[PDB]
Design a protein around this ligand. Sequence first.
Ligand code: DWZ
Length: 265
Amino acid sequence: DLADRFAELERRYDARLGVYVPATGTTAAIEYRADERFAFCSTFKAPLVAAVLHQNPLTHLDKLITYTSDDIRSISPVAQQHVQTGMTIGQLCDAAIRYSDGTAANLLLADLGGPGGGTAAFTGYLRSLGDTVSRLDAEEPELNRDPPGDERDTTTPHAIALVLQQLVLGNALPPDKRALLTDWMARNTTGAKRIRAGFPADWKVIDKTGTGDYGRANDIAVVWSPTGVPYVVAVMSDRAGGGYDAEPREALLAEAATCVAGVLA
Ligand SMILES: *C(=O)[C@@H]([C@@H]1N=C(C(=O)O)[C@@H](S[C@@H]2CN[C@H](C(=O)N(C)C)C2)[C@@H]1C)[C@@H](C)O
């Protein structure tokens, strides 16, 4: 019984866990707290890259963006290496997805442009995909810091799974732009201990992680069975009971993903 297993994990990790897998052909939707709000943390960077791709000719990827010391305000493993030379939009998309680079995401928000440093256009992009739930209100680092229960900078496992499904499996993007997004997520370096850890090696996994204060740990993925049947898997968690400094616990996500993988196999 999945719901019992997920409740057990909540008790084990003193956590709140949300899980959504959209219905398919012959699988029912899997849902646990799936309509509860959880902080996006860095999972917003997947739809952000989609927004930027959609908004511009493909060769906008080649535009050089320059930035400086006062632009580095959050974990930025790539942008910190590159501050002296600048980064192209393509490099920024790569870093935002594959290293979950915060400065890259801030610069991409600015590229999208408009009110709230790009957060309003980002939210507008989600609305165009029929997501009337999610909202982005701040950039890095503030978007990870909203107190438990606060709706700012939140999505739900349900809302984000339906968004990701459109982006990767559906027709939200033209095939060329879709492939760019899928490949970046395929090559993610931050997800080995999350949804990836719950699925057997012969299943393909592409994903974007999120980690934040109050013990926040998220992962959104598309997985393909060894016969090429795709499923979207959104797992979100927090450990608000430990306060602001509560440690995120990836193991929770690995276990929840293992439970999902068992139903889908
Ligand atoms: C987004 O959630 C935030 C960043 N996203 C992270 C993630 O998805 O895991 C981490 S960065 C990632 C894990 N640690 C590695 C690292 O190189 N350092 C921590 C230095 C890579 C991060 C909280 C947001 C700040 O963009």
